[PDB]
Design an enzyme around this catalytic site. Structure first.
Site, PDB file in Angstrom:
ATOM      1  N   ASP A   1      -9.266  -3.210   4.560  1.00 49.45           N
ATOM      2  CA  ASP A   1      -8.886  -2.998   3.161  1.00 49.45           C
ATOM      3  C   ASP A   1      -8.367  -4.286   2.525  1.00 49.45           C
ATOM      4  O   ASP A   1      -7.177  -4.596   2.589  1.00 49.45           O
ATOM      5  CB  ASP A   1      -7.837  -1.886   3.141  1.00 49.45           C
ATOM      6  CG  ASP A   1      -7.452  -1.419   1.754  1.00 49.45           C
ATOM      7  OD1 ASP A   1      -7.892  -1.991   0.730  1.00 49.45           O
ATOM      8  OD2 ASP A   1      -6.655  -0.451   1.741  1.00 49.45           O
ATOM      9  N   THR A   2      -9.259  -5.030   1.873  1.00 50.89           N
ATOM     10  CA  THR A   2      -8.835  -6.299   1.295  1.00 50.89           C
ATOM     11  C   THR A   2      -7.870  -6.125   0.126  1.00 50.89           C
ATOM     12  O   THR A   2      -7.158  -7.072  -0.223  1.00 50.89           O
ATOM     13  CB  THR A   2     -10.063  -7.094   0.865  1.00 50.89           C
ATOM     14  OG1 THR A   2     -10.882  -6.310  -0.013  1.00 50.89           O
ATOM     15  CG2 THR A   2     -10.866  -7.521   2.113  1.00 50.89           C
ATOM     16  N   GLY A   3      -7.805  -4.941  -0.454  1.00 50.42           N
ATOM     17  CA  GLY A   3      -6.856  -4.583  -1.490  1.00 50.42           C
ATOM     18  C   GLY A   3      -5.467  -4.241  -1.008  1.00 50.42           C
ATOM     19  O   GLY A   3      -4.535  -4.070  -1.802  1.00 50.42           O
TER      20      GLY A   3
HETATM   21  C1  LIG Z   1       2.046  -3.798 -10.523  1.00 50.09           C
HETATM   22  C2  LIG Z   1       2.654  -3.262  -9.243  1.00 50.09           C
HETATM   23  O1  LIG Z   1       1.737  -2.455  -8.568  1.00 50.09           O
HETATM   24  P1  LIG Z   1       2.222  -1.478  -7.353  1.00 50.09           P
HETATM   25  O2  LIG Z   1       3.060  -2.225  -6.399  1.00 50.09           O
HETATM   26  C3  LIG Z   1       0.653  -0.822  -6.464  1.00 50.09           C
HETATM   27  O3  LIG Z   1      -0.227  -1.913  -6.564  1.00 50.09           O
HETATM   28  C4  LIG Z   1      -1.476  -1.708  -5.888  1.00 50.09           C
HETATM   29  C5  LIG Z   1      -2.154  -2.858  -5.192  1.00 50.09           C
HETATM   30  C6  LIG Z   1      -3.508  -2.641  -4.500  1.00 50.09           C
HETATM   31  C7  LIG Z   1      -4.161  -1.265  -4.519  1.00 50.09           C
HETATM   32  C8  LIG Z   1      -5.505  -1.008  -3.788  1.00 50.09           C
HETATM   33  C9  LIG Z   1      -5.193  -0.186  -2.497  1.00 50.09           C
HETATM   34  N1  LIG Z   1      -4.188  -0.909  -1.746  1.00 50.09           N
HETATM   35  C10 LIG Z   1      -2.936  -0.294  -1.278  1.00 50.09           C
HETATM   36  O4  LIG Z   1      -2.673   0.849  -1.465  1.00 50.09           O
HETATM   37  O5  LIG Z   1      -2.106  -1.247  -0.572  1.00 50.09           O
HETATM   38  C11 LIG Z   1      -0.729  -0.873  -0.288  1.00 50.09           C
HETATM   39  C12 LIG Z   1      -0.584  -1.315   1.210  1.00 50.09           C
HETATM   40  O6  LIG Z   1      -0.515  -2.692   1.088  1.00 50.09           O
HETATM   41  C13 LIG Z   1       0.281  -2.935  -0.148  1.00 50.09           C
HETATM   42  O7  LIG Z   1      -0.340  -4.023  -0.970  1.00 50.09           O
HETATM   43  C14 LIG Z   1      -0.964  -3.397  -2.037  1.00 50.09           C
HETATM   44  C15 LIG Z   1      -0.276  -2.004  -2.196  1.00 50.09           C
HETATM   45  C16 LIG Z   1       0.146  -1.615  -0.963  1.00 50.09           C
HETATM   46  C17 LIG Z   1      -6.442  -0.044  -1.649  1.00 50.09           C
HETATM   47  O8  LIG Z   1      -7.054  -1.292  -1.515  1.00 50.09           O
HETATM   48  C18 LIG Z   1      -7.402   0.842  -2.456  1.00 50.09           C
HETATM   49  N2  LIG Z   1      -6.904   2.256  -2.407  1.00 50.09           N
HETATM   50  C19 LIG Z   1      -7.460   3.248  -1.458  1.00 50.09           C
HETATM   51  C20 LIG Z   1      -6.784   3.091  -0.011  1.00 50.09           C
HETATM   52  C21 LIG Z   1      -5.322   3.572  -0.113  1.00 50.09           C
HETATM   53  C22 LIG Z   1      -4.465   2.956   1.070  1.00 50.09           C
HETATM   54  C23 LIG Z   1      -7.636   3.961   1.042  1.00 50.09           C
HETATM   55  C24 LIG Z   1      -7.580   5.468   0.678  1.00 50.09           C
HETATM   56  S1  LIG Z   1      -6.510   2.883  -3.926  1.00 50.09           S
HETATM   57  O9  LIG Z   1      -6.135   1.840  -4.833  1.00 50.09           O
HETATM   58  O10 LIG Z   1      -5.465   3.863  -3.777  1.00 50.09           O
HETATM   59  C25 LIG Z   1      -7.998   3.645  -4.605  1.00 50.09           C
HETATM   60  C26 LIG Z   1      -8.198   5.134  -4.404  1.00 50.09           C
HETATM   61  C27 LIG Z   1      -9.469   5.816  -4.945  1.00 50.09           C
HETATM   62  C28 LIG Z   1     -10.476   4.990  -5.677  1.00 50.09           C
HETATM   63  C29 LIG Z   1     -11.730   5.647  -6.212  1.00 50.09           C
HETATM   64  O11 LIG Z   1     -12.706   5.424  -5.224  1.00 50.09           O
HETATM   65  C30 LIG Z   1     -10.270   3.491  -5.857  1.00 50.09           C
HETATM   66  C31 LIG Z   1      -9.026   2.789  -5.313  1.00 50.09           C
HETATM   67  C32 LIG Z   1      -3.477  -0.097  -5.218  1.00 50.09           C
HETATM   68  C33 LIG Z   1      -2.133  -0.312  -5.904  1.00 50.09           C
HETATM   69  O12 LIG Z   1       3.064  -0.201  -7.971  1.00 50.09           O
HETATM   70  C34 LIG Z   1       3.456   0.859  -7.106  1.00 50.09           C
HETATM   71  C35 LIG Z   1       3.806   2.091  -7.943  1.00 50.09           C
END
Ligand SMILES: CCOP(=O)(COc1ccc(C[C@H](NC(=O)O[C@H]2CO[C@H]3OCC[C@H]32)[C@H](O)CN(CC(CC)CC)S(=O)(=O)c2ccc(CO)cc2)cc1)OCC
Lengths: 99, 99
Positions: free
Chosen positions: B25-27
């Site tokens: 998960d690069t996100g």
């Molecule tokens: C301005 C401040 O923002 P913020 O801190 C949050 O910011 C964020 C930063 C990056 C992301 C992207 C998200 N990464 C993530 O969850 O990472 C967590 C762990 O590592 C930390 O680093 C980043 C956050 C923490 C992941 O890549 C993608 N996801 C799915 C995965 C979930 C684990 C697999 C199911 S999904 O986005 O849910 C998603 C669901 C359905 C669909 C349609 O298909 C598309 C996308 C999301 C929010 O506010 C908090 C309230």
């Protein structure tokens, strides 16, 4: 190009005639972008991740350009805290993971 | 290996002597696994996702092998919807994005 992961993989995208920054996100099935008033019809959707679900608007056959690479597919628009390019569009620009 | 993105990039990992499936998960900044028993001390931590914040148990300096590649780093354990490998460990195994 090659993008290391020391920092967030942020890139500039072009969508709806606007430029935005978004994450290249292999963990997202679909692309999710900040609120923007795109023209055309849409369908309501709910998408979930860490923390639960948010409500988004699903737009189909949207043109996005990502680092000069063109793609066309579904974009979900809603109150996301982060713009993510998901696999639906990453496949179209030929993006792979490599190690 | 080179991993295309037409399917979820799921791989087998080994942690605490147990095999599990996880998503590259690069996100994700951080690595978050579903509830499980891990040995050692842990500190409570909060992490935020698309839908808000959750409580996790933070385990530091944990050995984890991802698709044949060793890492030793921070692993968060809690009610994530799916096991995700985040950038803190993806960098350790030399993972980049390429297109
Ligand atoms: C301005 C401040 O923002 P913020 O801190 C949050 O910011 C964020 C930063 C990056 C992301 C992207 C998200 N990464 C993530 O969850 O990472 C967590 C762990 O590592 C930390 O680093 C980043 C956050 C923490 C992941 O890549 C993608 N996801 C799915 C995965 C979930 C684990 C697999 C199911 S999904 O986005 O849910 C998603 C669901 C359905 C669909 C349609 O298909 C598309 C996308 C999301 C929010 O506010 C908090 C309230």
């Amino acid at each position: 190009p090659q993008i290391t992961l020391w920092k967030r993989p942020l890139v500039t995208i072009k969508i709806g005639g606007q430029l935005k920054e978004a994450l290249l996100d292999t963990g997202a099935d679909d692309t999710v972008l900040e609120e923007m008033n795109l023209p055309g019809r849409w369908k309501p959707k709910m998408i979930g991740g860490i923390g639960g679900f948010i409500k988004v608007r699903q737009y189909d056959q949207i043109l996005i350009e990502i680092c000069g690479h063109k793609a066309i597919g579904t974009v979900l628009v809603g109150p996301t805290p982060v713009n993510v390019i998901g696999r639906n569009l990453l496949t179209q620009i030929g993006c792979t993971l490599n190690f």
